[PDB]
Amino acid sequence: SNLVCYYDSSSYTREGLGKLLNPDLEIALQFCSHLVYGYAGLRGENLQAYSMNENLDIYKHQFSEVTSLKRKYPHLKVLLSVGGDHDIDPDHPNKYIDLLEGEKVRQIGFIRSAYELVKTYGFDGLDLAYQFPKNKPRKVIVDPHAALHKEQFTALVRDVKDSLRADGFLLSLTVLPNVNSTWYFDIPALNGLVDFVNLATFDFLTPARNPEEADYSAPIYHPDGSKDRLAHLNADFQVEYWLSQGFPSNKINLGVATYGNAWKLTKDSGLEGVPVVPETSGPAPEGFQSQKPGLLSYAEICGKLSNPQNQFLKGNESPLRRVSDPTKRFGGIAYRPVDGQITEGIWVSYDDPDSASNKAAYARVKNLGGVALFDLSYDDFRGQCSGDKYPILRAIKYRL
Numbered sequence: 001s002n003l004v005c006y007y008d009s010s011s012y013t014r015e016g017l018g019k020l021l022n023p024d025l026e027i028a029l030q031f032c033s034h035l036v037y038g039y040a041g042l043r044g045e046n047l048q049a050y051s052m053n054e055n056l057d058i059y060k061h062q063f064s065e066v067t068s069l070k071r072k073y074p075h076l077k078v079l080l081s082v083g084g085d086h087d088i089d090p091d092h093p094n095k096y097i098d099l100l101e102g103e104k105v106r107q108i109g110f111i112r113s114a115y116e117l118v119k120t121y122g123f124d125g126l127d128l129a130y131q132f133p134k135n136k137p138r139k140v141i142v143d144p145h146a147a148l149h150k151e152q153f154t155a156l157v158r159d160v161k162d163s164l165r166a167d168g169f170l171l172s173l174t175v176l177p178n179v180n181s182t183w184y185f186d187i188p189a190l191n192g193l194v195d196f197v198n199l200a201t202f203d204f205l206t207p208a209r210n211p212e213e214a215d216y217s218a219p220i221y222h223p224d225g226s227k228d229r230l231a232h233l234n235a236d237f238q239v240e241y242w243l244s245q246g247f248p249s250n251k252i253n254l255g256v257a258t259y260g261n262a263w264k265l266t267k268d269s270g271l272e273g274v275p276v277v278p279e280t281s282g283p284a285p286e287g288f289q290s291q292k293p294g295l296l297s298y299a300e301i302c303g304k305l306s307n308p309q310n311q312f313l314k315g316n317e318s319p320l321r322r323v324s325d326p327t328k329r330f331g332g333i334a335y336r337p338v339d340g341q342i343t344e345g346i347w348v349s350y351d352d353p354d355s356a357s358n359k360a361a362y363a364r365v366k367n368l369g370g371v372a373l374f375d376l377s378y379d380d381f382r383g384q385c386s387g388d389k390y391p392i393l394r395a396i397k398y399r400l
């Protein structure tokens with residue numbers, strides 16, 4: 001099976017423990033079948049593909065430092081990913097749709113630019129992690145041209161593929177969290193156009209989208225215990241959906257995240273950790289390593305879990321408690337409620353090595369092509385949690 005490892009290059013320049021330099025990157029490569037370099041973006045002035053950190057990717061040669069890793073790993077495939085929800089442009093918030101709705105000249109510009117990036121820097125292919133509009137978050141019609149958009153995307157994928165054929169370059173698509181395949185993906189038309197598809201079957205709920213309640217963010221199956229949870233929000237529904245639409249199972253990769261979604265709790269959230277957790281208050285304070293409110297890396301989460309040793313810590317240092325439904329269907333929970341001394345409450349939905357392993361087993365059972373891991377920079381590459389580096393990656397590979 002495949003093990004498609006995403007690499008967010010912004011991780012190269014992170015300060016402290018979050019920094020992922022190339023020697024640490026390379027260690028993942030005895031487990032990854034594919035490396036995907038993230039993320040190129042769209043220029044708001046003409047929507048061509050371009051590096052969102054030219055100084056690093058191009059002027060300090062990081063694109064080709066990473067693709068030249070194939071010299072050391074002759075079976076490794078390296079792709080370049082566009083979008084990935086990392087193309088954040090408040091100045092041009094309609095780029096991805098405008099590219100779909102674009103005139104030939106505009107689309108050709110993108111196709112040519114994206115092609116140039118792949119070829120010039122030694123990549124084996126392109127990942128279209130298209131930033132479509134997502135499911136509207138339920139609080140407490142987003143796109144009325146979805147069907148037009150679906151058609152335009154199919155056509156754009158065909159033309160992109162066409163540009164890559166002569167070189168034999170791969171094309172993958174990534175269906176990003178809460179991107180709805182009914183609205184945008186003409187799945188029977190894609191089998192003949194793309195080498196594989198990555199379903200990002202995680203972040204179904206996040207503190208950014210769902211600041212006022214918390215629930216499992218990447219369960220395999222639907223948890224009946226989560227009241228009123230939308231039934232398409234689980235990995236199995238997404239996978240079966242793609243299979244339903246006639247996509248070959250072995251061209252599908254199951255997305256698994258290495259980071260957790262972390263909500264700030266309130267007194268009114270109560271003391272129990274099984275979701276749905278009410279009266280939450282947006283993202284939890286950022287971690288010191290990952291510096292992203294509402295996100296924590298696996299090492300940051302592992303580092304907070306309660307043990308007999310850290311038992312003595314109190315107040316806002318008291319350790320997090322594990323909640324782990326024994327059916328292995330839903331994924332991990334670690335939390336600390338607002339209570340007395342504890343003023344800073346937090347609820348984290350995440351996969352650890354065991355639960356990621358579970359996802360890998362499911363993928364194997366469903367005869368999928370493999371797993372796509374988002375991303376190496378939040379796996380514990382330094383070995384902080386147990387001493388073993390890349391504990392989530394290795395656990396997944398064990399079971400594919």
Ligand SMILES: *[C@@H]1O[C@H](CO)[C@@H](O[C@@H]2O[C@H](CO)[C@@H](O[C@@H]3O[C@H](CO)[C@@H](O)[C@H](O[C@H]4O[C@H](CO)[C@@H](O)[C@H](O)[C@@H]4O)[C@@H]3O)[C@H](O)[C@H]2NC(C)=O)[C@H](O)[C@H]1NC(C)=O
Nearest residue numbers: 135179180181182183222224229230231232233237238241
């Ligand atoms: C794109 O987004 C749309 C929503 O805008 C989404 O459609 C929704 O799909 C789900 C999943 O099929 C539908 O929910 C099911 O609906 C039926 C009928 O109401 C229920 O019988 C089902 O309940 C069965 O299963 C649930 C969990 O398995 C149980 O909790 C429940 O008790 C039942 O056993 C289930 O609720 C939903 O009705 C539509 N919604 C709308 C607004 O039309 C679509 O799936 C998304 N596409 C993808 C690929 O994600």
